[PDB]
Design a protein around this nucleic acid. Structure first.
Ligand SMILES: [Mg+2]
Ligand SMILES: [Zn+2]
Ligand SMILES: [Zn+2]
Lengths: 67, 115, 196, 46, 49, 49, 258, 34, 51, 147, 528
RNA sequence: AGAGAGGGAACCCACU
């Protein structure tokens, strides 16, 4: 759903990279260029953003039950 | 449900001895050192240091089970030399070399950060 | 090529699949008609001149990957596997935990299995784009190592990483609903919700 | 003594009574959602 | 009035036919749901061919 | 179910492209219960007039 | 019969990682130092989360989990903090904990990102690490909110992975396997390591039977909770402390036997 | 003209068109509709 | 007992800081249903502090 | 442990044990496995696609693109995958020198490693574990209950 | 009706009198554990804290049982029921007054089971007596039944979601009966084929096959680490096989330390040449493929599944007969522990590099496929022109079918042989096949060279359509590819028509597996 | 300090 805070294998802090990753994607970069522009050398840290699906944006369309 | 609490790896309890010495009876001058609430991150170094003594005839360690936090270090030394003395010398040698390593790392940090 | 040009620019030309059916390019062939059709597998091989096989093709398969089902389409390289393994994966694929629906917070489903951080597969098929498996995935990409070890991955078992699990690796959440209503009856037994 | 329920589609809150038919006052929506408990919750961050 | 007959979702006689995804999210129904199932006593039923 | 014969359960040649060859319940319902292929479509039928 | 003298040669020192070489020491000592990097280094991480209110799409325990893995600046406080279970306080105090407060309600049509910046500490030193953007905790729709008080306590990597200060600890010895510990079937296909010193004509170094593992290469990349060099300093101090306590119990047992 | 070797990316365009036009459950919905 | 069904807080020991509900209680010990973990553990009454 | 995980190739299996990061093996870099599977699960089941998925996973995660795994392609075979992997400083066939997590001595064999896609199945062990001792008893006959 | 209530498999006679629900039983998933003995099962605490053993209060255990009663229930060592002399039950879970918690000689205490208690462990299809054996309880934290590796073979449990049933003998008399009859040390050799059923399982077998090779040498530190795990080691480090340059123990010396007592066996390795015992070197094996264990010490040979497996006359069978049965239990435990702990140093894997042959082998495979395909085509053109003559005993079509199947089978065998001559002795497929732990030569041939002919009901793929197998083939096409022969391998991947025919073969296999079970079970029930 | 439990039958999906 939401981006994990840490890479599962390393523990590298990847939760702060997602919005910048989207910004680099919409700035006409390739996904690999965006990944190592954010500074992710190990591929286990690269799969955290390369294969993430931001489902919480789908979850936010519904009106909150409690109000 | 049956998940052991996370502090079972390193925290002892009332009635638990950190180290237990049992004199081996199969061969002369041999002892089993049962260390409670430890893992390879102690026994491996202890075994490596005990292999550097010219008076230790056997230096090994094993975990009975990875889910139960205890190790047994078997030490057989040459006669006239107690295995407990070898153990307490290995610990002191490890402390000495680690303190020297820490001081040299401090010196290296001072060299690197100040050019 | 003009069909592809008009088909790439959808939502602009309003050129749909039905327009291509109306164009006399594709048509639906049933099982009876397959007995009387010469079917080309792929055009890059079965329409160029060679030592000719038949040279009398009537229809051409769109893509061979469309012979598979919904659960056999999420298997990467299914032709490299063995068929019983593909069948067993087809059985397991309808069982993987994941976000089964987008509005799961509203649904009072019994036995709702959802996942913390589902991921799309790094190794995917083209058919997952049409099952929308990249939008409601089921599973996490994991750095696996195929190694003999201490002896706990012995007979169809796997050794996991405790630190990774502590970082939210496959940590799921299980919802279970309980329904109950009272019954207004002929005054002999009358259920009512109250603190006993 | 009255229990406060959140009125489903309305997302507003209202009181309820024992042996009271479940109805909202805004549009009579039948589905009520009970408010979150007032007692403390503590979660180990593990 | 003859009687009530069940309707499978996403039909031409269901309420949410041709509704946009925003309208579906307003109805607490996801656009991802393919429909094709009946709601009988709150239980989702699938007619196996 | 529980029939010792195999012809109603086997993967016939005419299952190509219409029904998935791999997906099936591997219990006592092998081949009997099947899953439709992706592009396969069941003709809803029209009048012959 | 005694310990060899090790030496340290640091190749680079950055705010993220430290790369150094330890020579003239045993393999078990080197591996333990790496394991103490991963596990035995104590840092400050959130462990006690009290959710006052929550209306977000993510449930309470999911938010508490995400608050756990957030790194905290513990460069000098972790040496002063006692372990929470060891303190004689009334089950919480500023000597074994750091208080954090989050109070966010979304009152706008834009999706409001509750990031790590909204975590407000009472201790100015212990703050979330986040040039770089903040760590996204939870997104909020209009009308949703979350209020919580989080206590962070001292702990190390054995207890939980949220007390792990290292992003990655690369460790390798004998990059051209002159010891031949690993046996390549076809060494031509194998890429050379970063520390290889053989010409491109040669694949692997000749074997020597009298050699031993030495000159260990480390690449300790921190996650931001600690500076990469204080991870090593705390690790060496922690390993020495563990051996000292083991010696103290050893002395007690020996005196008990005699 | 024809698609000589860009057919690999041309076939999946028509697959996408089919599944955007029809969908995965046309059998159930069309059968109940008729 | 009086402690049954009372939200308690372990104020001493390895489980310090955990909020739970007392399921069973004795003169010596009491079982606490932890709100965080999926586990019920027993601790001394001297280590418990009610809310 | 006991929780039932599975690959995308019918390679199911329960969790045998969970080691911490310091006990798990590691490469020349700091990468440790998340899952360690049995080498003996491959040869008789013959899931070579699992190995190819792992190899393509390494290529995809290094290249920075979601790899393609359509069955009948002829544009992607194992040799092309190996040639693409070789450019990123790895072995041709995905093998990588793992260092032992306990002793630190590098493993003599070269362990095949890389990212696959694993699925957690609905079957836990908490949902299946149950014991009983003179509990509820049926009324038709005085035998224990079912389930 | 009453007759319907009695006549069924869910009635009174079978469903209630023969097989009935029983108290004191647990059912949970099993996960492997190689660090406990073969007669030990690792049960969870929550299971042990719910199943009780009625221990009689005697002056020997009165203080221990008193302390357990003082703990009460849910203090795991404690108990839940205390039974009076007149059969009166007193609860310990409801915390009675401390006055009636005394113990005098004669009381019963239903205490939570601890380590060393005996339980019955069984899987469901109890087709033989080794599918239901007695184990000793070991309390391990997590919530699974941790049982050993070698007990998998008699149970046929492959840990992939398997859950087992664990019964607890309540009486002391039946506890001794299970200990003296149904112990897994006492159920090593089966009576059905006078051979062991335990054997050595896959990973330990491969690691011990690589361990006992001639070129395996161990440093002193590694030797001490390995010898630490021997339960039957008398504390004497053996003299090294290499003294002066780099004191280096051979793995056979450590395995000789494993081998108990003084047993003598002569076995042959799986890859022992049959022409080796004819000429010279019949006693000094150049390939080290002649297993000789002599005076309790492994002289030579590499131990494959024909040495340590379930085959009759193996090392374990002789260890059971010449030595005791407790000694064989120690033998199994020592093998598993020390070989696994050496496997940590060695390491064993499998990968895509083990499934790829060099280009010369691929050229040989493709040349063989092309030659066989052209041979089939020319046989077809002979059959069309009536130049094929019928074999005496069958029709002309079958003389043709026999010729085509013979050619394709010859192609499959030749390609498989040419593929399995190019493993280079480090291929892990060969490592598992030679040891016999998992797989065979056919799997190597299908992965590397060619899958082979696909069959349905013992013959080729039938003409489901009108005189053609698939709509992509011309009518009346009796060629290799049209009729189901797959010339590709699992490494290269299958074409869609070959994929469909391969799915047909897999479907036939699954149908056989799914239909066989009920008939076999009914035959077993009638026989018993 | 007040201490036991009940439903029952039918039919679907999987699990080894
Ligand atoms: Mg099984
Ligand atoms: Zn309202
Ligand atoms: Zn304090």
């Amino acid at each position: 759903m939401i981006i994990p805070v840490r890479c599962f294998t390393c523990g590298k802090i990847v939760g702060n990279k997602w919005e910048a990753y989207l910004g680099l994607l919409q700035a006409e970069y390739t996904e690999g260029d965006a990944l190592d522009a954010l500074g992710l050398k190990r591929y286990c840290c690269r799969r955290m953003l390369l294969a993430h699906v931001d489902l919480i944006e789908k979850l936010l369309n519904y009106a909150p039950l409690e109000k | 449900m049956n998940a052991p609490p996370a502090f079972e790896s390193f925290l002892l309890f009332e009635g638990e001895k950190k180290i237990t010495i049992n004199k081996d009876t199969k061969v002369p001058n041999a002892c089993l050192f049962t260390i409670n609430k430890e893992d390879h991150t102690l026994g491996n170094i202890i075994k490596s240091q005990l292999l550097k003594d010219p008076q230790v005839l056997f230096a090994g360690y094993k975990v009975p089970h990875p889910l139960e936090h205890k190790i047994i270090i078997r030490v057989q030394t040459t006669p006239d030399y107690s295995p407990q003395e070898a153990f307490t010398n290995a610990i002191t040698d490890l402390i000495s070399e680690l303190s020297l390593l820490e001081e040299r790392f401090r010196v290296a940090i001072k060299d690197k950060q100040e050019g | 090529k003009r069909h592809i040009d008009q088909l790439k620019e959808r939502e602009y030309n309003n050129y749909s699949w039905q327009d291509l059916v109306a164009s006399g390019v594709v048509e639906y062939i049933d099982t009876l008609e397959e007995e009387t059709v010469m079917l080309a597998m792929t055009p890059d091989d079965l329409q160029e001149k060679e030592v000719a096989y038949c040279s009398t093709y009537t229809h051409c398969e769109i893509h061979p990957s469309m012979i598979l089902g919904v659960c056999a389409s999420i298997i990467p390289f299914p032709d490299h596997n063995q068929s019983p393994r593909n069948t067993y994966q087809s059985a397991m694929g309808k069982q993987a935990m994941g976000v089964y629906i987008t509005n799961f917070h509203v649904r009072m489903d019994t036995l709702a299995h959802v996942l913390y951080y589902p991921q799309k597969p790094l190794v995917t098929t083209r058919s997952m784009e049409y099952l929308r498996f990249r939008e409601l995935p089921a599973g996490i990409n994991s750095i696996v190592a195929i190694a003999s070890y201490t002896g706990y991955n012995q007979e169809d078992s796997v050794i996991m990483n405790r630190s990774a699990v502590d970082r939210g690796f496959f940590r799921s959440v299980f919802y279970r609903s309980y329904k109950e209503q009272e019954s207004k009856k002929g005054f002999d037994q009358e259920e009512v919700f109250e603190k006993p | 003594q009255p229990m406060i329920y959140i009125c489903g589609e309305c997302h507003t809150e209202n009181e309820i009574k024992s042996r009271d038919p479940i109805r909202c006052r805004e549009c009579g929506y039948r589905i009520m959602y009970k408010k979150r408990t007032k007692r403390l919750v503590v979660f180990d961050a593990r | 009035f003859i009687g009530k007959i069940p309707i499978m979702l996403r039909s031409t006689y269901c309420l949410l036919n041709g509704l946009t995804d925003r309208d579906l999210c307003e109805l607490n129904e996801c656009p991802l749901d393919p429909g094709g199932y009946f709601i009988i006593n709150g239980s989702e039923k699938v007619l196996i061919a | 179910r529980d029939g010792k014969l195999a012809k109603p359960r086997q993967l016939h040649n005419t299952l190509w492209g219409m029904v998935c060859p791999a997906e099936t319940p591997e219990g006592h319902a092998v081949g009997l219960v099947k899953n439709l292929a992706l592009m396969a479509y069941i003709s809803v039928g029209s009048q012959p007039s | 019969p005694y310990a060899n003298q090790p030496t340290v040669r640091i190749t680079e020192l950055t705010d993220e990682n430290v790369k150094f070489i330890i020579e003239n020491t045993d393999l078990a000592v080197a591996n333990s130092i790496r394991r103490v990097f991963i596990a035995e280094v104590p840092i400050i991480a959130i462990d006690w989360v009290q959710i006052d209110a929550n209306s977000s799409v993510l449930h309470d325990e999911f938010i508490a989990h995400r608050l756990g893995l957030i790194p905290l600046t513990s460069d000098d406080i972790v040496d002063k903090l006692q372990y929470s279970r060891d303190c004689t306080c009334e089950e919480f105090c500023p000597e074994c904990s750091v208080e954090f407060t989050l109070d966010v309600r979304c009152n706008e049509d834009q999706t409001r990102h509750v990031t790590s910046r909204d975590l407000i500490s009472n201790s100015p030193r212990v703050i979330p690490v986040t040039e770089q953007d903040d760590i996204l905790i939870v997104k909020l729709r209009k009308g949703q909110e979350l209020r919580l008080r989080a206590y962070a306590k001292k702990g190390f990597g054995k207890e939980h992975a949220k007390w792990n200060p290292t992003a990655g600890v690369a460790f390798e010895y004998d990059p051209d396997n002159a010891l031949r510990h690993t046996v390549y079937p076809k060494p031509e296909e194998w890429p050379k390591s970063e520390y290889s010193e053989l010409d491109e004509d040669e694949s692997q170094a000749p074997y020597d039977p009298n050699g031993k593992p030495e000159r260990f290469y480390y690449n300790v990349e921190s996650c931001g909770s600690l500076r990469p060099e204080t991870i090593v300093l705390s690790a060496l101090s922690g390993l020495k402390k563990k051996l000292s306590d083991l010696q103290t119990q050893l002395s007690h047992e020996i005196q008990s036997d005699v | 003209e024809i698609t000589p070797d860009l057919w690999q990316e041309a076939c999946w365009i028509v697959i996408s068109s089919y599944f955007d036009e029809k969908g995965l459950v046309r059998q159930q919905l069309d059968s109940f509709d008729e | 007992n009086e402690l049954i069904g009372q939200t308690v807080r372990i104020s001493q020991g390895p489980y310090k800081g955990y909020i739970g509900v007392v399921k069973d209680a004795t003169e010596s010990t009491a079982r606490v249903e932890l709100h965080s973990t999926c586990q019920t553990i027993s601790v001394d009454r001297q280590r418990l502090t009610t809310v | 442990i006991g929780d039932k995980f599975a690959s995308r190739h019918g390679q199911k299996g329960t969790c045998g044990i969970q080691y911490r990061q310091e006990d798990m093996p590691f490469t020349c870099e700091g990468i440790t496995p998340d899952i360690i599977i049995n080498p003996h699960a491959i040869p008789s089941r013959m899931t070579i696609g699992h190995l190819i998925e792992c190899l393509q996973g390494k290529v995809s995660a290094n290249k920075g693109e979601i790899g393609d795994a359509t069955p009948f392609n002829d544009a992607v075979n194992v040799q092309k995958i190996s040639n693409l992997l070789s450019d990123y400083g790895y072995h041709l066939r995905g093998n990588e020198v793992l260092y032992n997590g306990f002793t630190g001595r590098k493993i003599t064999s070269q362990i095949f490693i890389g990212p696959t896609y694993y699925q957690r199945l609905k079957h836990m062990v908490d949902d299946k574990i149950h014991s009983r001792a003179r509990g509820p008893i049926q009324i038709l006959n005085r035998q224990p209950m079912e389930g | 009706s009453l007759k319907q209530r009695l006549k069924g498999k869910e009635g009174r006679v079978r469903g209630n009198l023969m097989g009935k629900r029983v108290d004191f039983s647990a059912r949970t998933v099993i996960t492997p554990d190689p660090n406990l003995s073969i007669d030990q099962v690792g049960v969870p605490r929550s299971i042990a804290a719910n199943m009780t053993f009625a221990e009689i209060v005697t002056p020997f255990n009165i203080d221990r049982l008193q302390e357990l009663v003082r703990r009460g229930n849910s203090q795991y060592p404690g108990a839940k029921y205390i039974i009076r002399d007149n059969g009166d039950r007193i609860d310990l879970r409801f915390h009675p007054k401390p006055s009636d918690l005394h113990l005098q000689t004669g009381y019963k205490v239903e205490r939570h089971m601890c380590d060393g208690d005996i339980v019955i462990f069984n899987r469901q299809p109890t087709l033989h007596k080794m599918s239901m054996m007695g184990h000793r309880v070991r309390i391990l934290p997590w919530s699974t039944f941790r049982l050993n590796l070698s007990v998998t073979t008699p149970y046929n449990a492959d840990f992939d979601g398997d859950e087992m049933n664990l019964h607890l003998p309540q009486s002391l008399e039946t506890r001794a009966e299970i200990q003296e009859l149904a112990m897994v040390p006492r159920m090593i050799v089966t009576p059905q084929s006078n051979r062991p059923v335990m054997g050595i399982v896959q990973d330990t077998l491969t690691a011990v096959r690589k361990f006992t090779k001639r070129d395996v040498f161990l440093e002193r530190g590694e030797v001490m680490n390995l010898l630490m795990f021997l339960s039957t080691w008398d504390g004497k480090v053996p003299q090294p096989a290499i003294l002066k340059p780099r004191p280096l123990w051979t793995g056979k010396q450590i395995f000789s330390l494993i081998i108990p007592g003084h047993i003598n066996c002569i076995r042959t390795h799986s890859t022992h040449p049959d022409d080796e015992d004819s000429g010279p070197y019949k006693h000094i094996s150049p390939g080290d493929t002649k297993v000789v264990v002599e005076n309790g010490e492994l002289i030579m040979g590499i131990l494959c599944k024909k040495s340590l497996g379930t085959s009759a006359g193996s090392l374990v069978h002789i260890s059971y007969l010449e030595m005791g049965h407790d000694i064989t239990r120690l033998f199994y435990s020592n093998i598993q522990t020390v070989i696994n702990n050496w496997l940590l140093i060695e390491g064993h894997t499998i990968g895509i590099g083990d499934s790829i042959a060099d280009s010369k082998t691929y050229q040989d495979i493709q040349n063989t496929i092309k030659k066989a395909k052209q041979d089939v085509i020319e046989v077809i053109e002979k059959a069309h022109n009536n130049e094929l003559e019928p074999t005496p005993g069958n029709t002309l079509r079958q003389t043709f079918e026999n010729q085509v199947n013979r050619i394709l089978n010859d192609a499959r065998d030749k390609t498989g042989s040419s593929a399995q001559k190019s493993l280079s002795e480090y291929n892990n497929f060969k490592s598992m096949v030679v040891s016999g732990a998992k797989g065979s030569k056919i799997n190597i041939s299908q992965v590397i060279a060619v899958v082979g002919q696909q069959n349905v009901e013992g013959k080729r793929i039938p003409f489901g359509f009108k005189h053609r197998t698939l709509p992509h083939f011309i009518k009346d096409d009796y060629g290799p590819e049209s009729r189901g022969f797959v010339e590709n391998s699992y490494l290269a991947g299958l074409t869609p028509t070959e994929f469909f025919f391969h799915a047909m073969g897999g479907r036939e296999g699954l149908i056989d597996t799914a239909v066989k079970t009920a008939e076999t079970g009914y035959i077993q029930r009638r026989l018993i």
